[PDB]
Specification:
The protein is mostly helical. 49% of the residues lie in helices and 2% in strands. The protein binds protoporphyrin IX containing FE and 4-(diazenylcarbonyl)pyridine (3 copies). Residues 116-136 have a biased composition (Basic and acidic residues).
Length: 249
């Protein structure tokens, strides 16, 4: 359903150079999970009915950074600003989605296709559109489905983003990694989710909701058994997420 815009040769060269620089920077800083979260929080505010929100650069605005759901993302924005300044031709919107793509790649995840051309929009979306970690499957469908326009398969695959990183008691209040390898992108989120609560690892109520839903559970089982299947569905979902409202949504 996508029709991607034309960007200049100079834009495309910038991106390819920005992609490379982001790889080295994100690997060295150890900030891949935070960058993935930044990219996803940027995108996940899209509402399909009104065509508002989405991956359009607004997360850098103080008003959006102030959203409680975005606690700690100011760190991410600050970390990227020197690099972003090396690529003045790129939109923030593109730059942050590119950072998300690279975050997945440099932790060993799938190569998520990337298309340039998002424009930086002037107005952040209203607060409160991002998912609540204490809620369950109905809520996940409200947010990812009714608002964003993503599928049930997308919800499960994207929840697998928790295969990298950790919660922080000073940010959400939850604490610790979902996996034993929080800088490695693999199917371990699902493996852990299935085996039960292991000391030192985190499961949100929203993660656990996947285990009891009739549609979500078969997907968890598939991804735990088949990492290639996970990688394929993840790459599809991340691309869709990163393109919400862009080039047609
Ligand atoms: C399914 C609904 C989701 C809920 C309820 C949720 C909730 C959370 C919460 C509460 C945290 C901890 C923030 C903190 O205290 O630092 C977090 C972290 C994180 N989330 Fe999600 N999330 C969801 C989906 C996603 C998606 C779709 C992605 C990306 C594809 C994602 C990527 C991440 C990453 C990488 C972290 C780790 C951040 C870090 O290490 O600093 N999450 N998520
Ligand atoms: N959680 N913050 C980070 O990942 C980070 C912040 C500053 N420098 C390196 C990494
Ligand atoms: N950690 N949560 C996220 O990254 C996120 C999940 C859904 N929509 C936007 C952002
Ligand atoms: N679902 N809640 C969140 O994503 C969150 C809430 C507050 N601070 C960081 C993250």
């Amino acid at each position: 359903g996508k029709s991607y815009p034309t960007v200049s040769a100079d834009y495309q060269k910038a991106v390819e150079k920005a992609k490379k620089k982001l790889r080295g920077f994100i690997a060295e800083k150890r900030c891949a999970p935070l960058m993935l979260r930044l990219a996803a929080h940027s995108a996940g505010t899209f509402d399909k009915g009104t065509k508002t929100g989405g991956p359009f650069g607004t997360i850098k605005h103080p008003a959006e950074l102030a959203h409680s759901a975005n606690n700690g993302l100011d760190i991410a924005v600050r970390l990227l600003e020197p690099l972003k300044a090396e690529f003045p031709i790129l939109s923030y919107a593109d730059f942050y989605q590119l950072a998300g793509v690279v975050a997945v790649e440099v932790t060993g995840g799938p190569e998520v296709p990337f298309h340039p051309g998002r424009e930086d929009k002037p107005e952040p979306p209203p607060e409160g559109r991002l998912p609540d970690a204490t809620k369950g499957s109905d809520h996940l469908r409200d947010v990812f489905g009714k608002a964003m326009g993503l599928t049930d398969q997308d919800i499960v695959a994207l929840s697998g983003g928790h295969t990298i990183g950790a919660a922080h008691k000073e940010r959400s209040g939850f604490e610790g990694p979902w996996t034993s390898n929080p800088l490695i992108f693999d199917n371990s989120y699902f493996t852990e989710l299935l085996s039960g609560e292991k000391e030192g690892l985190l499961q949100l109520p929203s993660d656990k909701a996947l285990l009891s839903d009739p549609v979500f559970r078969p997907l968890v089982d598939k991804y735990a058994a088949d990492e290639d299947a996970f990688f394929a569905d993840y790459a599809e979902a991340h691309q869709k997420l990163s393109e919400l409202g862009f080039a047609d949504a």
